[PDB]
Write a protein that binds this ligand. Sequence first.
Ligand code: NI
Ligand code: NI
Ligand code: NI
Ligand code: NI
Ligand SMILES: [O-]
Ligand SMILES: [O-]
Lengths: 570, 570, 122, 100, 100, 100
Amino acid sequence: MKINRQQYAESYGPTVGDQVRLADTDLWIEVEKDYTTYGDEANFGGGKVLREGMGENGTYTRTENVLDLLLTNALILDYTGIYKADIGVKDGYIVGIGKGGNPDIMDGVTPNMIVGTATEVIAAEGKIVTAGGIDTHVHFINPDQVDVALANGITTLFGGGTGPAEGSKATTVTPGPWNIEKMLKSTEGLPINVGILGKGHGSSIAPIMEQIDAGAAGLKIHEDWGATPASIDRSLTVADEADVQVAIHSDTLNEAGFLEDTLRAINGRVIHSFHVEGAGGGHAPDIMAMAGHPNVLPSSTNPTRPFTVNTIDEHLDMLMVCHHLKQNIPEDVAFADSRIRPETIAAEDILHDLGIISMMSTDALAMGRAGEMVLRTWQTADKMKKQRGPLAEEKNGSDNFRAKRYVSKYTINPAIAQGIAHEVGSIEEGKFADLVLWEPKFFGVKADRVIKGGIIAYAQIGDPSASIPTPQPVMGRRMYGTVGDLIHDTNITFMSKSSIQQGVPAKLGLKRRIGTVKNCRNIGKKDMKWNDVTTDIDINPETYEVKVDGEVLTCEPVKELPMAQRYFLF
Amino acid sequence: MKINRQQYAESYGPTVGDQVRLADTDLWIEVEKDYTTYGDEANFGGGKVLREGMGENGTYTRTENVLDLLLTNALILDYTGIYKADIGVKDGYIVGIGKGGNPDIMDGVTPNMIVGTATEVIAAEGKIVTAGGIDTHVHFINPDQVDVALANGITTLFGGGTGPAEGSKATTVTPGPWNIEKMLKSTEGLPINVGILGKGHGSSIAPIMEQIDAGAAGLKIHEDWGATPASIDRSLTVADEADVQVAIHSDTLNEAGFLEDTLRAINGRVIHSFHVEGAGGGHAPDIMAMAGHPNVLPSSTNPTRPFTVNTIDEHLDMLMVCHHLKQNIPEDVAFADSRIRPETIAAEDILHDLGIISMMSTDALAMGRAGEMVLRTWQTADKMKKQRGPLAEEKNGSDNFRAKRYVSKYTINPAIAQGIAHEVGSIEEGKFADLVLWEPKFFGVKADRVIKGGIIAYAQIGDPSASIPTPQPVMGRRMYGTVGDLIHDTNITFMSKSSIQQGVPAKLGLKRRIGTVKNCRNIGKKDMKWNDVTTDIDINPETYEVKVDGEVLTCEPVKELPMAQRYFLF
Amino acid sequence: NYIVPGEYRVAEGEIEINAGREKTTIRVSNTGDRPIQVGSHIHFVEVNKELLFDRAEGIGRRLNIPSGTAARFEPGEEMEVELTELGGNREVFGISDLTNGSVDNKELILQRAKELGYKGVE
Amino acid sequence: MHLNPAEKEKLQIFLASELALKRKARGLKLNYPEAVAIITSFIMEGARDGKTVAMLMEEGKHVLTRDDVMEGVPEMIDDIQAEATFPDGTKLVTVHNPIS
Amino acid sequence: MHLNPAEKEKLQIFLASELALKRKARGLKLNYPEAVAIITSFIMEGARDGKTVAMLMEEGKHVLTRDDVMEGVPEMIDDIQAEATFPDGTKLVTVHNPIS
Amino acid sequence: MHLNPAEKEKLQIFLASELALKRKARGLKLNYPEAVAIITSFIMEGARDGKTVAMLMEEGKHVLTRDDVMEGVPEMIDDIQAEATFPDGTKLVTVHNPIS
Ligand code: NI
Ligand code: NI
Ligand code: NI
Ligand code: NI
Ligand SMILES: [O-]
Ligand SMILES: [O-]
């Protein structure tokens, strides 16, 4: 018996060679391989396969190769591939990617993916499944920001702040041992993974290092605290001893140095360059040249992503109002004109497409949108396909190469940069079960279900009073993973090795899973998945023209984007 | 001095022989007896009786027969009677039903119902007070479902699920030790009593039993996991060893057996038959014949309750859309027509009225409404009074017999079925103080105040910014019983004896009151209060006609119900 | 170029299910007065006693239909179905308790089936 | 008023529908949430009017047409579901392929 | 806007009142929450207009009559209470037996 | 509808604006939250209409004048900010000194 490919895809999701449109973009992903055995697909419901003695094994106890959870028929989109598989979860971790069911009667069952008495089922047929997003530029300003991030598929927030204090409104910084302890305690109630950055400022080691020992997961150097050669140097000396990452927002004003002075202070040490294009901050006008260097892990923030007809008008005004700058003070206008540049924003689109900027991030509530990192990644990939064509590396008319390059920017690359990719950032065996299910029509716009540590934390679901869960109003809602003590088991607090060794979790009474930050100091640009290009970036000091390999990088702003007015009520 | 009966009822609530209309129904309850001493009624306020040296005793410490809480002048509606009394609560339990006040100066004071320095007062004059509802068919799909249930007077949720996973969307199952542990932790944040059902599926004992030892309170057998003779048999073997209840949703498809095969697998052992009419699931078309057997504890789910002109159109479509069935596939149409039957739904109304179906339940968010178990119980009693007349057993023109038969279906009978009636399910001395106050105009529609463990958990109350609590908007709101650590003392997690003996609460850090499930295996239909009828139910396989004692059970669907458009904004 | 958000563009071809496994056609009769629907993955010899067929021909087999679908038998209906072979270890446990081990033990499966009144033990 | 949780949430649908109908009145092609809101509110107001479930299953297919909505919106909406209090209590309405 | 908790909640009353007034305009007899919403919103808008508490205690008895509401609704509503910001700050209005 | 948190909150702005516009229509001078609501909703509806950020920065200065609002309200409002989905995605609009 044979099934035509349309009916097969409608029943089990797509298989090898089938393509799926990402939301209302022009981007098509193609199934590269499929782990199933045709005719033995897993599925759940009345008269379906996952029943006792059939696709569900009735013999084995949970310890005996049985799953806690099987996601059936998932289309995985990950740096590791675009492919069809069942995903098996146990003890809150991904333990198997392959074929689930019952070896009693089915061919091709992955040996540790038995569906047994202990197994819950999520149907992923016709869904795209990605790793949870890793946002490494979060200002902790307003706790309502967490649901915003979950609704767009973000599962890890790295950054700093104590709420709407001016220091936190400007900088991703939780300063000093006491504010760090207070925000680790606050984190016990936030249904998302978290890592906290200390203040990367000081001329003595001890004031900086005591933040790492208090439980910071990293440091932030910010011009508003003095992005001086001394602060840069001491922060990187602490980071090299403590094995944590340092993020930098450099001296826009060039007060103590130009870009070459910041790079000399860095002295070849590993650093994460935030908002590398520079609208969000950094040496005017040439900060984006950082993205060419082998020791720089470069990220964009999201409001420049991608370059649109409203971008410059919006940014110039935002910068003037946020800095209390006057339109009639020529020094204020000169500063704004030196910082908000169509030449560098246009080139930033192309540098993403070329794999020269490795990461996306939000800059949530400081100059960026908590719920638009994933959204704007795909809008950028879509604009680049329209303006630059399919990349040379593509085959079968699919956009798989671009899709792996772009998904890497908000999943695995930030995780690698932060020293947390042993736990999160990709759909791989042995990693924490942070998974996002997407209906393809809503891909990158609104997550269907967000799984945190193998339990649904957040879902688009309807009327809680209804006979069934789908009647209106369908909206983003916190699920049982966020309730009671389960918030502790479904989420990770990332901390320095030294704070963990010194017993900070026990001292503060932290009940969350504790993740160790490690392996941040002997990586570089070469370790960024699909985004590993080093090159000499030239930024003309007179015209702000960006050149790579002797070629001007320029593109037009677009009047319309996909993933926009078709979807949003405001 | 004498008080006329209208003024007496207006001041103190009704007394012996007085009748009260239940909401906008035709049903009248009559006060059977009154514990008061006329002239010594308790009441609280300016110049009222419960004042120091007067109706409040100023001598006794809390330990010395003093209450923590007195509900004054309650009209109790319970399987035990419809009567007027004060209700005394202490240590979160009902300790006295009688007459409260001060033995110094009052006649007839129940000796352990002293109002003292330690006593809070709730005025129940002109209120109807019932036990909290016990819902034994809950899908844990959307945490917003808890407030829905509290607003309609439900205080205990028994069922299963991990949130909006397909297994949980179909079945009341929390599968395996790990998902059970995670949902016991989640339960720490749910302001309602909870018991969790494991997966009643397997061909070996150990995979099933390890769920009971992990902290499950019972099992669910569901056709979507394979409601096979083996799964039935192993689940009941586990249940007989562990002293927990088993719920069944049988094989609708008759794939491995007909009803007589399921009954042979059960082999005279005690079982709770869910949605026994069968629209919600079970052997097509004759599952409802289960309700005739002495070892079956039979429940309805609520969307068939009662039989209305929109019922069939609504159910046929709901079933087709939820099963992805096509109107143009004749096997799909035949299946739907075999499952959704006006003949069995009409007979289900009458079987409730006759005390042959013992229990109501919701099927919350799977095929039933979390906030309509109590609502639809009374709509059913009202329809039966209109179509069948006052029952033979009635006196004084009251509906007391029907009111005790129907209140039992969602209070004491589910508690008995689950093995938790030592703790909850009725207003009796020695039971947990889960109490619902109703204004008679809103009886069974919207609860005034829901008391959990002797503290108000939920109330219809107004503007929190106002001078007084009644100004608009008046809406259902969580009260102090749900806040902070008090959520632990006001709610019970029901667990198996074995999980309690093995220290699961300490292992998981559960702070909630722990209730023991017990005495579930040597009960039967005879133990269902006011609903103990066993009989041969015949369901014609050709016409789906239901007969009891040689008589066809049929009634008409109604075009209108009470407790509907007078009350609800949508 | 009309955009249907999230649309599929499936490849050409057809998917062959249960490829390389022996297929067997048998006649099956619902001798009961209530409908019986049988899923793709139930060990076919263990279906409802009132289905009449050559029970030996169901041993080690299941319906050759798409995973998750079912064959329906109305009361009194006789029709042909196509079976395919069970895979993996070719062991069955539970369901009707006729096998509880290797499907190779045909003698023991049929003795249990006959004792319990599964129709068609020849 | 004694609002329960569902009554509070469903006020949001009415509001979204009023917003969408103003957008349609000034000549905009409606988007996905706008279209869903209008049809949902139409079903709930029909139940309040005392229509049957069958009448609303029919009517809900004629509230908005292809030329009222943006490209792709008809194909994004497979069905709209709403529960409301009919004269005979709460019922579920499903409108299949509401926009052809 | 600087909304406080009460300002956010009381927007709900206005919305429920708009919903109820549309239902009344298409010829429906109003139910209990509908009637309460209309009279409540009337009191709050009257305070905003600068009426006195005494004027609103009188007017609130003439917003809806028996023939605007379903059977039993007049007898279900003993009084409606609302707080609003008058020119002289927040005051409580109680309307006794608003529907005779 | 698939509402996200921002979509749910921003429905409140539309509602407050409808409330304020009814108050203005019956002849009241508007207060601080009323004025902010009207201008905010105007910006969000303009984005939905497909106006540019520059057009809304200009228009937002002419929605309400001094004689529409109470004494001191113009001087209380230094600027109104709103984010909405333009044809080219979410953008920030700041209207400086909207009421002269
Ligand atoms: Ni910055
Ligand atoms: Ni920042
Ligand atoms: Ni069921
Ligand atoms: Ni159920
Ligand atoms: O930033
Ligand atoms: O069910």
